[PDB]
Ligand binder design. Structure first.
Ligand code: NA
Length: 175
């Protein structure tokens, strides 16, 4: 009850996928790991405490900043990619993430402002939490799918490609 469980589970789900790989030479992995860590912080932040109001807003801003890095790099991976099927799939997912993370910023600010205000009912409070939780699950899922496809895409690369990512296997774990 102290820490939201469905937010922590979503963060955990992405952490498991991202920790299948090394961050070295791979930004997408590094940013996805930062995102999973921040989303676990978010599950504590949702239950407001003095000084959590500014932290809730900043945590969502950091999550959105890390998701822009994932989006930006995955778009670069996809354009070079020779397989149309993979290239198209990767581009749809990359496109979705900015919208989801923009919504995370809105809902976090709404939740934080509310915490700051004593009057709101337990219903409005629970509902603002459930909207945040839904967004968090959607975000974690989208990034996880983006990781998978960016790796699949990596196998096929343009001979003349400007940059490459490193995909080295590591033993995954949960935070
Ligand atoms: Na390892």
């Amino acid at each position: 009850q102290p820490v939201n469980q469905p937010i922590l589970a979503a963060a955990q789900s992405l952490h498991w996928e991202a920790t299948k790989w090394s961050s070295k030479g791979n930004d997408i992995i590094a940013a996805a790991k930062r995102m999973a860590l921040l989303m676990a912080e978010m599950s504590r932040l949702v239950r407001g405490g003095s000084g959590t109001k500014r932290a809730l807003i900043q945590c969502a801003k950091d999550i959105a900043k890390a998701s822009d890095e994932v989006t930006r790099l995955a778009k670069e991976v996809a354009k070079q990619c020779t397989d149309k099927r993979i290239r198209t799939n990767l581009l749809q997912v990359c496109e979705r993430i900015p919208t989801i993370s923009t919504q995370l910023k809105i809902l976090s600010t709404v939740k934080a402002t509310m915490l700051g205000r004593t009057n709101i009912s337990d219903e409005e409070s629970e509902q603002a939490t459930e909207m945040l939780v839904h967004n968090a699950q959607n975000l974690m899922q989208s990034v996880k799918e983006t990781v998978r496809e960016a790796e699949a895409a990596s196998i096929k690369i343009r001979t003349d490609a400007g940059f490459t990512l490193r995909w080295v296997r590591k033993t995954p774990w949960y935070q």
